[PDB]
């Protein structure tokens, strides 16, 4: 080992350099291996360099441990993480550090595919929400900003996105699986562990690592978890896979990127930000991409998390990233009080990839829903706060809003059935207050299989292997139209008639609670 | 032999698709197939009809899908996953060598209902499914029909007269 | 003759300083140094001179891995970009260097980037108009010759149509090429621009292209973004100067060349004036604009996307783009939504050389008069919802015909679709696109129906569908009158 | 992490210790970010938040007063401190006038273990 110089000075995280006699060249952001100790090291890396000689350095470990005088060593080498198969079971460090609980390196920043190397976005993510699988559809490729403010549901569809692709990875191939990569920077590190727990719990851990940098670890640290999280990505782009990458958040990265560019004396800007923090998410965010065929056809896709502030969208950071984005998710407190949970805005929420991520079975059920949704809001919004409306649009319509209404995600098979039978009227003489009952009766249950009418071949809603059908032949086609038909209008005459009309006689204390509880767990299943 | 093929952007493209499917047959366990349509996009030298209908070969004739077992298995997502990539992704069409396949297989799980929608879609696009699988479907059919597995015991049961949140199983 | 060489003595992010042992280059000199030590080839051009021997240089690409000290090569000139037929059908980075893949480009000669804008001798005080054959424009908004132009439009407007049609117009009527410059453009756009430009063939690569591609995108730094627009310019002054012919420049958002040049004096130190656009903001965009002129030889007109942050058009970047503005070509959701395509809303748009001192008369005289009709029409649907057609008099309820059939009757078909959609495309001249708008205001022709109107172009073309309408009611009405008299 | 106890830790508050630093910031040398804040506060709250949390061994259920100048939770100061907690109180002034106390705004805060699972169902 050959060293470059001694440390100089240090600004918390940031530390200086002053050069040996042997003035000798370190490139521009390599890494910088600081001699703490005789067997401890505290790796860094370079941020600028000076006419004088002189380095400012970013730390990422063992900040404490750091003391002017030091021997400061050179790698000559770019920062670079463990990659391959062998990471989707663990939480991590992004300096790839296994972070415990109760060979292949990659570049950290590498630069995107060129637009040759790219296809048109083809294929659905499907986050389990009918909401985002029906009017802003996620694909492949496709990343989409989730703005909001605090507790909205923002990691919710982050995190129940992967939930989804758990029961599909296992049956499908081992090349279209989409995999995944939460990136925590600058959250509590008991969320992580929460993550943790949870994403092992439904078995989502065998498809999904985690980047994490809390709160405590160093703004460089949390400055390159994104990088690193999308470096794992780049390999299973590389080899065909289908890889997701969450973060939560950006908006805290943008604080380190500050931290580091101000105690470094770099020139600010706006909210006291540099000029190439827009460059900062570019970096980042171009590297999401729908692969070539003649490069395994894999993809990377992005759900970067943005937290507003009094549902500000002027904000530099927001501006920056729906300048960026391919579409965006825009969530309202307003509206995740009043029970509408996920709380969407679907005016402000866009995806600029409408139809060619959706699926043969999918175009023709949310191009009703737009053109049923688009209506309900000049009904809705005109309408009083008294007024009583029959009508076709407003009933379709408030129906579906509380079929919107999940916790949790839902097979694709679930997420049609249900609307179907919205744009097409049969939930029509049901209540507002009995949709979700409705629908888990239609799912999991089976009345017409279970009160006789089993006038219907094939279509029933136990299998669970007849949606590879729909999303082939489609709905619309030949076969299963009228089978569907027959199903929903057997279901919603036994309903209409067994349940619904037992309902409304509990004119009792006790059990109108009885049902109120049954109805908001019906929720929450469905 | 082979008509030409171009990509997106009109570069020329490769045909020879034989090594590769070779490379699928002796597939032991029908993922290192799907790993190898990779290679083939990778090598500018995408999959065929043919090559598509050799994997679907492997996801029947294998025994599972990777050496050690895995969870919530299930051969007829594999086989269907790949038509929808064949279709809608690619554009190239199956044919009766394909739904063959995709017949058998529910021919052997049992599963007799979703072998009629295979029969329903056969018969929509164009094409004589193999009597001798119509066959078998309706003997499970009419098996299970004697024995009550027409449909499972756990929808038969009657159902919670009491909305009570436990009753209901939630 | 031998060549100049300097060294490294410091890297800041993009920003380098460069000294020298002679007399330092020129500004907005380029520097190149071998891709031997970075890994790839890297151009920086120096913007600020620090001293007798230094020069700092904005970097184009990523100076990762750059080490201190290293050689660096001056080009003895600014960036060289290629020029020429060749050009057409291909994609070029901010330094020439094509990156569709598609082999190497065999151009004669390459010009630098940063050419002086033309002497007021060089100009052409006398407004023209460009015939773009889209009725709708060439009726209210007439795209001046070596003027600039606003397009206001996000997603689902026939955006892409509309510059497609364009060029494929000017490549036939005016007989002149088109050049297009994404300036921090979304990477998946250049592919989702670029195979469109397959499928309409405005790019045939077995053949004759017509526009030239020019794609800064969001991964490349600021320095690069900001010299984008200067690339596909230079594109255009060939030929507008040595084939002599007219020229259109497609702008993909100014808000990010505006954006991107506010971070490179960020990153030089220089104060920002105002919310945080750089002090050089109109100097930076009007060295730009000054370029885009016509000339005694030719001419370069530009379609300018402009995003408006938070719809304030106080904000500098659009009040300063909105000075070198001539007209605004607004596009519209819910006229897209009516059927309409080009989805153009007439009345919230504008043009400067709406004037009979620059137009003909009757042009001028013809397009007000549709002004006033559709505005009183406006009026009248905001009665009609409210009180009802029948509220109307005899003279107003004739002017709510003819207003529904001029709106029908600016719906065009496009060339670019005609594979897609299936149906022609009308390039319609301007003369009697005038006598068509009079003949429908002058009341001359007010038997022919609403809908013949629709998606359509000429008034020659419509008596057709008219004729083609009436013979299949006629075969109808002659079908069920023998399918029940038979029975 | 000694005695295995549980612990309370009361703090008025969180609010002061910022500013503390930010008062210092300018005179060690380090350019001020937005507001009027130090660079590093997001940092330096970070390394002082993470301390408070329970283990294996032990439970701190720490308390934590903040001050929102003007009223203005767009405050970086407050807004860094929603992520480093679990019940996120909220008081405004508009109960308070109206003779409210505790003048606790329900809509605007929110907390963790309010679920359906960890709580009673009737509760949630
Ligand atoms: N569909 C839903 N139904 C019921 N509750 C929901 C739903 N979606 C989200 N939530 C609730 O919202 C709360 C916050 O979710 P989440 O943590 O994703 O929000 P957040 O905005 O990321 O919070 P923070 O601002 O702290 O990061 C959780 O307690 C969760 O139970
Ligand atoms: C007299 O001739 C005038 C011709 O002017 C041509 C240049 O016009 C500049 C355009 O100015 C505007 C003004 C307003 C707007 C609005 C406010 C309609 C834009 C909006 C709605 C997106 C904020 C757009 C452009
Ligand atoms: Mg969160």
Redesign the pocket.
């Known amino acids: 080992k050959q060293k470059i110089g001694f440390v100089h000075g240090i600004d918390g995280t940031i530390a200086t350099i002053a050069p040996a006699a042997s003035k000798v060249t370190v490139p521009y952001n390599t890494v910088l291996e600081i001699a703490v100790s005789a067997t401890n090291i505290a790796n860094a890396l370079v941020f600028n360099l000076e006419k004088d000689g002189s380095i400012g350095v970013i730390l990422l470990d063992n900040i404490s441990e750091v003391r002017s005088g030091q021997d400061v060593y050179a790698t000559g080498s770019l920062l670079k993480i463990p990659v391959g198969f062998h990471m989707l079971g663990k939480i991590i460090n992004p300096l790839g550090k296994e972070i415990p609980t109760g060979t292949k390196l990659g570049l950290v920043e590498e630069m995107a595919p060129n637009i040759v190397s790219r296809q048109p976005v083809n294929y659905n993510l499907l986050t389990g929400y009918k909401v985002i699988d029906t009017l802003i559809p996620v694909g492949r490729g496709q990343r989409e900003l989730i703005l ?1 403010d ?7 569809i982050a995190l129940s996105t992967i939930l989804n692709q758990t029961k599909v990875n296992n049956e499908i191939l081992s090349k279209n699986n989409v995999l995944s990569v939460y990136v925590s920077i600058g959250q509590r590190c008991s969320n992580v562990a929460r993550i943790h727990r949870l994403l092992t719990e439904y078995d989502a851990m065998k498809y999904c690592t985690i980047v994490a940098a809390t709160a405590a670890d160093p703004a460089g640290l949390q400055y390159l978890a994104p990088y690193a999280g999308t470096t794992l990505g780049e390999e299973f782009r590389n080899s065909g896979r289908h890889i997701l990458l969450v973060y939560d958040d950006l908006s805290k990265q943008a604080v380190s990127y500050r931290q580091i560019s101000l105690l470094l004396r770099r020139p600010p800007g706006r909210e006291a930000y540099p000029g190439d923090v827009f460059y900062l998410h570019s970096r980042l965010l171009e590297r999401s991409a729908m692969m070539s065929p003649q490069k395994g056809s894999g993809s990377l896709t992005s759900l970067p998390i943005v ?1 507003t502030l009094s549902n500000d969208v002027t904000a530099y950071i927001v501006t920056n990233v729906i300048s960026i984005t391919d579409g965006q998710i825009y969530l309202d407190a307003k509206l995740f009080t009043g029970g509408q ?2 709380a969407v805005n679907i005016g402000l929420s866009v995806s600029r990839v409408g139809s060619s991520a959706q699926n043969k079975a999918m175009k023709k059920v949310g191009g009703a829903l737009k053109m049923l949704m688009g209506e309900y809001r000049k009904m809705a919004g005109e309408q009083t706060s008294g007024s009583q409306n029959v009508s076709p649009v407003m009933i379709r319509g408030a129906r579906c809003l509380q079929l919107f209404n ?2 949790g995600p839902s097979y694709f098979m679930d997420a049609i059935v249900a609307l179907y039978a919205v744009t097409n009227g049969y939930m029509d003489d049901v209540k507002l207050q009995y949709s979700k009952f409705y629908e888990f009766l239609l799912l999991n249950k089976d009345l017409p299989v279970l009160y006789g009418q089993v006038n219907n071949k094939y279509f029933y809603m136990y299998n669970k292997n007849l949606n590879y059908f729909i999303r082939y032949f489609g709905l619309n086609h030949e076969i299963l139209e009228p089978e569907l038909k027959k199903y929903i209008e057997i279901h919603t005459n036994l309903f209409l008639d067994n349940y619904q009309s037992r309902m409304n006689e509990l004119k009792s204390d006790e059990d109108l609670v009885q049902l109120k509880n049954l109805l908001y767990a019906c929720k929450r299943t469905v | 032999a082979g008509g030409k093929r171009y990509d997106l952007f009109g570069y020329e493209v490769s045909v020879a698709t034989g090594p590769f499917i070779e490379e699928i047959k002796k597939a032991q366990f029908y993922d290192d197939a799907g790993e190898v349509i990779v290679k083939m996009n990778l090598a500018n030298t995408p999959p065929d009809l043919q090559t598509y209908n050799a994997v679907l070969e492997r996801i029947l004739n294998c025994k599972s899908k990777r050496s050690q077992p895995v969870k919530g298995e299930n051969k007829f997502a594999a086989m269907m996953d790949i038509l929808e990539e064949m279709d809608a992704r690619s554009g190239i069409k199956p044919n009766a060598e394909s739904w063959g396949y995709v017949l058998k297989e529910l021919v052997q799980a049992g599963d007799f209902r979703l072998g009629w929608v295979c029969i329903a879609g056969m018969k929509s696009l164009g094409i004589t499914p193999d009597q001798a699988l119509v066959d078998a479907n309706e003997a499970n059919a009419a098996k299970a029909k004697a024995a009550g597995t027409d449909f499972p015991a756990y929808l038969k049961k009657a159902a919670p007269e009491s909305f009570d949140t436990k009753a209901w199983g939630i | 003759d031998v060549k100049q060489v300097g060294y490294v003595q410091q890297i800041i992010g993009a920003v380098v300083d460069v000294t020298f042992t002679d007399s330092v280059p020129p500004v907005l000199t380029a520097l190149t140094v071998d891709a031997k030590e970075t890994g790839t080839l890297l151009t920086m051009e120096i913007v600020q001179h620090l001293d007798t021997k230094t020069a700092r240089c904005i970097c184009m690409s990523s100076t990762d891995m750059l080490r201190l000290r290293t050689p660096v090569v001056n080009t003895g000139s600014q960036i060289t970009v290629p020029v020429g037929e060749a050009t057409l059908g291909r994609i070029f980075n901010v330094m020439g260097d094509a990156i569709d893949q598609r082999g190497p480009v065999k151009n004669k000669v390459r010009w630098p980037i940063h050419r002086k804008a033309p002497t007021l001798a060089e100009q052409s005080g006398k407004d023209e108009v460009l015939v773009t054959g889209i009725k709708v424009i060439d009726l209210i908004l007439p795209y001046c010759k070596g003027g600039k132009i606003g397009l206001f439009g996000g997603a689902g407007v026939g955006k892409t149509v509309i510059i497609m049609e364009l060029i494929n117009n000017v490549a036939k009527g005016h007989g002149g090429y088109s050049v297009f410059a994404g300036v921090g453009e979304r990477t998946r756009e250049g592919t989702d621009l670029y195979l469109e430009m397959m499928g309409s063939k405005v790019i045939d690569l077995q053949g004759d292209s017509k526009c030239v591609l020019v794609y800064g995108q969001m991964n490349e730094p600021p320095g690069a973004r900001a010299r984008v627009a200067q690339t596909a310019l230079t594109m255009a002054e060939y030929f507008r100067d040595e084939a002599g012919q007219d020229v259109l420049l497609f702008v993909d958002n100014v808000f990010r060349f505006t954006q991107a040049n506010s971070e490179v004096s960020a990153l030089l130190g220089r104060i920002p004036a105002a919310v945080g656009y750089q002090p050089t903001l109109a100097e930076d965009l009007g060295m730009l604009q000054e370029r885009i002129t016509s000339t005694v030889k030719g001419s370069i007109t530009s379609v300018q996307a402009v995003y408006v942050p938070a719809d304030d058009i106080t904000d500098p970047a659009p009040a300063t783009t909105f000075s070198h503005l001539d007209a605004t070509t607004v596009l519209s959701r819910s006229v897209a939504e009516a059927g309409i395509y080009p989805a153009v809303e007439p009345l919230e748009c504008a043009s400067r050389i709406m004037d009979p001192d620059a137009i003909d008369v009757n042009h001028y005289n013809v397009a007000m008069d549709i002004v006033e009709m559709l505005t009183k029409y406006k009026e009248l649907q905001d009665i009609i919802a409210v009180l009802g057609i029948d509220e109307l008099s005899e003279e107003d309820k004739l002017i709510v015909d003819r207003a529904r059939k001029v709106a029908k009757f600016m719906s065009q078909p496009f060339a670019v679709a005609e594979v897609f959609t299936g149906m022609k495309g009308y390039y319609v001249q301007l003369e009697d696109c005038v006598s068509d708008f009079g003949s429908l205001l002058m009341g001359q022709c007010d038997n022919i129906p609403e809908m013949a109107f629709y998606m359509v172009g000429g008034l020659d073309s419509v008596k057709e569908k008219a004729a083609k309408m009436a013979a299949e009611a006629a075969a109808m009405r002659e079908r069920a009158r023998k399918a029940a008299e038979a029975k």
Request: hydrophobic fraction near 0%; charge should be positive.
């Open positions: 909001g605090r507790q909205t549901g923002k990691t919710s937290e949970r996920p999940q916790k």
